[PDB]
Amino acid sequence: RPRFSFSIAAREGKARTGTIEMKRGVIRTPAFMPVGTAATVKALKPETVRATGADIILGNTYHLMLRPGAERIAKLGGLHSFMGWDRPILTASGGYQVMSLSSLTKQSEEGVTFKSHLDGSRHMLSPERSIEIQHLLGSDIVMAFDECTPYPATPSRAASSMERSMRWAKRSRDAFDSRKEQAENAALFGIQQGSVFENLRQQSADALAEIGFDGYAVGGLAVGEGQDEMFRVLDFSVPMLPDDKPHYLMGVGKPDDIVGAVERGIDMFDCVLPTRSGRNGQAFTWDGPINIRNARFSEDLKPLDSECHCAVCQKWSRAYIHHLIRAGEILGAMLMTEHNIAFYQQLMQKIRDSISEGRFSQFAQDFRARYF
Numbered sequence: 145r146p147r148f149s150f151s152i153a154a155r156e157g158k159a160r161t162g163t164i165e166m167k168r169g170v171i172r173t174p175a176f177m178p179v180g181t182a183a184t185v186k187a188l189k190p191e192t193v194r195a196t197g198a199d200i201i202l203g204n205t206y207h208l209m210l211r212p213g214a215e216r217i218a219k220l221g222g223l224h225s226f227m228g229w230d231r232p233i234l235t236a237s238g239g240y241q242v243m244s245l246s247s248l249t250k251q252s253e254e255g256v257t258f259k260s261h262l263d264g265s266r267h268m269l270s271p272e273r274s275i276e277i278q279h280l281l282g283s284d285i286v287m288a289f290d291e292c293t294p295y296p297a298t299p300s301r302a303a304s305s306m307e308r309s310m311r312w313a314k315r316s317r318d319a320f321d322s323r324k325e326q327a328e329n330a331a332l333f334g335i336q337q338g339s340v341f342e343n344l345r346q347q348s349a350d351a352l353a354e355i356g357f358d359g360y361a362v363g364g365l366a367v368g369e370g371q372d373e374m375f376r377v378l379d380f381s382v383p384m385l386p387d388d389k390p391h392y393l394m395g396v397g398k399p400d401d402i403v404g405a406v407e408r409g410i411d412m413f414d415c416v417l418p419t420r421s422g423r424n425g426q427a428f429t430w431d432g433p434i435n436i437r438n439a440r441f442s443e444d445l446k447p448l449d450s451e452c453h454c455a456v457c458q459k460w461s462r463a464y465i466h467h468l469i470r471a472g473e474i475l476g477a478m479l480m481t482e483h484n485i486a487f488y489q490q491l492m493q494k495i496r497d498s499i500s501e502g503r504f505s506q507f508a509q510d511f512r513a514r515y516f
């Protein structure tokens with residue numbers, strides 16, 4: 145019923161489990177959010193995404209702004225109505241994808257100018273334009289617009305990028321607030337930057353706390369620093385963010401990354417891996433990923449994972465899916481993606497249950513032992 149309310153039900157070490165109540169629904173945390181790139185979670189109907197246990201999905205602000213356009217979607221009734229998803233939606237600021245998929249990017253204090261990677265150039269993105277677009281889409285959790293620091297980054301480089309983003313965090317905060325409809329029904333998350341330098345991350349965390357946000361995201365990770373660095377950064381970074389506010393690790397999604405991140409205080413995750421690998425032929429199982437294309441699954445009558453309760457493992461065998469994917473059939477992409485998303489949602493449930501029960505440390509240990 146409330147606009148945003150985070151409640152921690154249980155803790156174990158730095159890990160915690162709880163819920164985020166929003167107008168459109170409850171979000172059980174640690175939570176994993178499927179990524180819906182072009183107003184659709186690849187190869188899945190919204191009902192199918194809900195069936196796997198997903199409480200929230202992530203929307204793209206860059207992508208959607210180019211096709212079909214923010215203003216267009218608003219006119220049509222908003223992303224929710226447009227895609228058929230009635231629960232909360234968190235939308236990226238667009239800044240990251242601009243710098244990765246845009247042609248001739250132009251950085252400046254006011255924002256970034258770029259060329260759409262497909263048809264001319266839907267061109268300008270600034271803190272306030274980002275917040276506007278996200279309002280037009282009608283997202284429940286809005287991400288402040290920032291400047292991601294590439295890896296590696298020198299201290300001065302990291303410093304100047306972090307400083308800029310904090311200025312942009314303030315601007316995002318103001319923009320968000322000026323739109324009453326948005327400020328009253330949505331939530332705004334700030335993003336900590338600073339690369340791998342704790343002094344920088346500390347500065348970023350303090351700035352952010354001074355401005356004040358509903359949730360704090362740890363940006364800058366999963367950009368090539370490797371699990372070891374990531375975890376090292378998470379170690380000192382997450383304790384810098386308000387404990388009573390959700391911590392969201394952006395773009396982190398290998399099953400072992402999630403488990404390790406939750407051990408360090410992360411509550412929300414998002415990643416294209418489950419959907420991506422699914423189209424690719426890679427299925428996640430409790431015993432490690434398997435590539436269904438491999439000849440040894442040609443006549444395997446067992447489900448993708450014998451402990452997985454998803455619709456695909458309950459109704460089809462590895463042999464059929466193996467065939468589907470090798471034949472290039474759409475159904476294979478559908479079934480694989482459904483399975484991977486279901487797997488990730490089961491992993492988040494197991495994490496949540498183990499934390500509530502004070503046995504997350506043993507679960508992580510057992511998880512890693514069998515998965516690897």
Ligand SMILES: [Zn+2]
Pocket residue numbers: 448449452453454455456457458483486
């Ligand atoms: Zn399954």
